[PDB]
């Protein structure tokens, strides 16, 4: 007789679901759990919005999970499971999605994840532009909201050493952009960071190609959407560029992520006045009383030995301490230069070239 | 003329006799295309009561759009339908309650369109006032519910370009996704000075910030707070924690009844679809399922939209805003009195406030 809670989790395939029921299986053999024990729930994402929010409420909520994980899907969004579980304010973690938007909490209230958004990409930029003493950046930045997240972020980093000179942003759809480009070659800062979607970057990747702005003494810095599909395609030799290690391992996400809940859920029962989410959808519009404070549990949040590094949120329920591949494109293949540890840069062996040659 | 289905969708108990009489006017539709209506009724407004409810008389009938009525203050409604609209590419107008609650940032693709003010209306309105009765010094507070940007900046906006000498003491910003075990609302709380308080919120959240305001002496006489519609709600439900002298903008019930309101939103399904089917020679097409959305989408447009904005019926300008609102609606200004009632105590209408007292009496 242990009070069995319910985890949730929507995800890619089945066997992530076996993944997800083992991680769970092994945080009660962990753990302490005569009071509490841990059971695991789960589908694999529905085809479209509307059944997908159905299969939420009739197979995770009908069993009162506490909190749902939820991969981004293959080849569709978490957004109707934010939704869906947002309503009851039970919290939501996402594994896998990087888009900025679901950092926003008058959308996605109930939303923590342990992949950091795009934005904070920025963070990396910053950190490069110390050790390489960078002090005279230009910024282009797509007109949308990924884009206006990262120049948000960066702006935070230089506005209170390295400062932008400027900051051009286009509409994501254009193609001629030499509008813009050639506003960027008179200036004097050769350092330039684009935040772009891959079809957006390959339009920039050209027009900046026809300008002769991919030559030597030209730095260009970058994000893992930059240097993915097409516009790994068009990039300029010397571009240096990001990839989140283990960004796309669901199932080691899977794994720290039930790390994670698990010790919430057993500090959340530390505390008194616990009450039970709510069964099922139907006839039920009240929010969860205590999903406001198993959020805030979540959030304060600490796994220092994860599979994926060290586990803490930000006050957006954002991973930090994120580790980053720093790859250079040389000879148009794609090489590891350097790693971002989570909050220090480590330069290996392979040298660094530049647009140009530039040793 | 041939028919198109329109669902009217009525929650809580319902005058359904005034509303089937209230479309008498059935000979009254002499565009290109006549409703076929079909009132339901529903107990349940959770996610899930709503969405197989209006997909299963999607895949019963053939229903071109959805008039939707509720008698709640469940602001969520409004979000719910949005996302069903969107999804399966269908008007629906939420003529009241919790379907008519300010959905600030709906989707691209939405076909949703509420009765009642936009946020910048009632940011607007609320200047209006504190002009009249010479209140220049003010705070606000909000949660993070969509529009709380939208709401600080037509304020802001509005005062930094003002002849009059407006003083906006503080902004605040208050987290109610975390719970406040910490008393950290408490803090936040205590920096006020301000005579004016605009607060932006929800309802339930209103009661809550109200019961931290007061145990900190922000109820007493010399704070007065001024709230938009969807914080009074439904004015028959008066939460205790409400400090009387609470002003509020409202579109609640009161001179705009609800078969009205049913009425002139099946004028505006139809005479928008007569339109389209008289400069195109075709309606879109009701969507046989919403368990098949994801590929019948190249099929689907909210081409309808741009005759939905522009409708006018037995000359009277039912226009929408861009956003999904109603363009000029006569708001209704209140007062929560000692005997714990909304009373009416101003009207504005042709962009005009008219208040009723020169000063306020005291409760
Ligand atoms: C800081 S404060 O306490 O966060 N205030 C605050 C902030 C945001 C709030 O709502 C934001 C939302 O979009 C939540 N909703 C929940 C309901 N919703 C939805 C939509 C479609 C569905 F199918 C469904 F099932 C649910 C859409 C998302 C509400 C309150
Ligand atoms: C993904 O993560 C798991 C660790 O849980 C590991 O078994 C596997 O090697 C990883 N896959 C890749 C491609 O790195
Ligand atoms: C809604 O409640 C009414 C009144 O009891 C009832 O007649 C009707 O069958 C109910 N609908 C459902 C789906 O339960
Ligand atoms: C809206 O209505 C009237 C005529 O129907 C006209 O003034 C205006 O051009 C219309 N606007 C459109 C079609 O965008
Ligand atoms: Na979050």
């Avoid at chain 1, 509409?171 to 200036?187: C, D, I, Q, S, V």
């Avoid at chain 1, 090489?335 to 971002?340: K, L, P, R, Y």
């Avoid at chain 2, 195109?280 to 904005?309: A, D, G, V, W």
């Amino acid at each position: 007789d242990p009070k069995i809670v319910n985890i949730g989790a929507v995800l890619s395939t089945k066997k992530h679901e076996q993944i997800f029921r083992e991680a769970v299986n092994q945080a009660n053999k962990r753990h302490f759990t005569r009071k509490i024990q841990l059971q695991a729930t789960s589908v694999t994402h529905r085809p479209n919005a509307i059944q997908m929010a159905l299969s939420v409420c009739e197979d995770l909520i009908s069993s009162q999970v506490y909190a749902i994980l939820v991969s981004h899907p293959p080849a569709l969004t978490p957004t109707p499971i934010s939704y869906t579980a947002g309503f009851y304010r039970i919290p939501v973690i996402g594994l896998t999605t990087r888009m900025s938007i679901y950092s926003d909490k008058s959308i996605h209230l109930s939303f923590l994840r342990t992949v950091p958004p795009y934005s904070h990409q920025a963070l990396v930029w910053f950190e490069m532009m110390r050790l390489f003493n960078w002090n005279h950046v230009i910024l282009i930045v797509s007109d949308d909201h990924e884009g206006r997240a990262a120049q948000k972020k960066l702006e935070t980093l230089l506005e209170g050493g390295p400062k932008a000179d400027k900051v051009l942003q286009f509409e994501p759809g254009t193609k001629n952009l030499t509008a813009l480009l050639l506003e960027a070659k008179e200036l004097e800062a050769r350092v330039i960071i684009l935040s772009a979607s891959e079809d957006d970057a390959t339009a920039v990747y050209k027009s900046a190609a026809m300008l002769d702005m991919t030559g030597a003494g030209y730095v260009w810095l970058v994000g893992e959407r930059e240097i993915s599909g097409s516009a790994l395609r068009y990039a300029p030799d010397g571009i240096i560029g990001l990839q989140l290690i283990n960004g796309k391992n669901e199932s080691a996400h899977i794994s720290d992520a039930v790390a994670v809940v698990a010790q919430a859920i057993h500090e959340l029962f530390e505390m008194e006045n616990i009450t039970d989410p709510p069964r099922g959808c139907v006839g039920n519009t009240n929010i969860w009383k205590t999903g406001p404070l198993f959020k805030r549990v979540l959030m304060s949040s600490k796994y220092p030995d994860g599979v994926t590094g060290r586990i803490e949120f930000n006050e957006d329920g954002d991973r930090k301490f994120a580790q980053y591949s720093i790859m250079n494109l040389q000879n148009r293949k794609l090489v590891q230069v350097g790693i971002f540890n989570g909050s220090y840069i480590i330069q290996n062996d392979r040298k660094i070239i530049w647009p140009g040659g530039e040793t | 003329p041939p028919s198109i289905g329109i669902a009217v969708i009525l929650v809580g108990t319902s005058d359904e006799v005034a509303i089937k009489d209230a479309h008498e006017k059935d000979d009254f539709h002499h565009l290109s295309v006549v409703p076929r209506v079909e009132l339901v009724a529903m107990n349940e407004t959770d996610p899930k009561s709503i969405i197989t409810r209006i997909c299963d008389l999607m895949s019963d009938r053939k229903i071109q759009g959805v008039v939707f009525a509720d008698d709640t203050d469940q602001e969520a409604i409004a979000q719910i339908l949005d996302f069903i609209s969107a999804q399966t590419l269908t008007p629906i107008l939420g003529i009241h309650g919790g379907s008519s609650m300010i959905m600030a940032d709906k989707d691209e693709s939405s076909m949703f369109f509420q009765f009642g003010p936009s946020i910048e209306q009632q940011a607007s309105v609320m200047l209006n006032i504190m002009e009249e009765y010479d209140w220049y010094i003010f705070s606000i507070v909000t949660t993070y519910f969509p529009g709380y940007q939208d709401f600080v900046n037509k304020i802001r906006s509005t005062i930094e370009n003002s002849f009059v000498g407006w003083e906006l003491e503080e902004v605040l910003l208050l987290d109610m996704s975390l719970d406040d075990g910490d008393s950290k609302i408490q803090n936040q709380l205590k920096k006020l000075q301000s005579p004016i308080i605009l607060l932006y919120c929800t309802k339930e959240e209103a009661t809550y910030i109200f019961e931290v305001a007061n145990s900190v002496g922000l109820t007493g006489y010399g704070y007065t707070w001024i709230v938009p519609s969807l914080v009074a709600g439904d004015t028959d439900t008066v939460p205790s924690e409400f400090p009387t002298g609470l002003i509020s903008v409202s579109y609640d019930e009161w001179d705009y009844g609800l078969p009205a309101r049913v009425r002139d939103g099946i004028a505006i399904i139809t005479t928008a679809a007569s339109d389209m089917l008289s400069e195109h020679s075709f309606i879109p097409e009701p969507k046989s399922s919403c368990y098949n959305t994801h590929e019948k989408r190249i099929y689907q447009s909210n081409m309808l939209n741009r005759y939905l904005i522009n409708v006018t019926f037995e000359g009277r300008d039912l226009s929408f805003s861009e956003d999904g609102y109603q363009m000029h609606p006569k708001l209704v200004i209140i007062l929560l009195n000692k005997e714990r009632k909304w009373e009416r105590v101003g009207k504005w209408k042709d962009k005009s406030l008219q208040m009723k007292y020169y000063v306020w009496p005291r409760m």
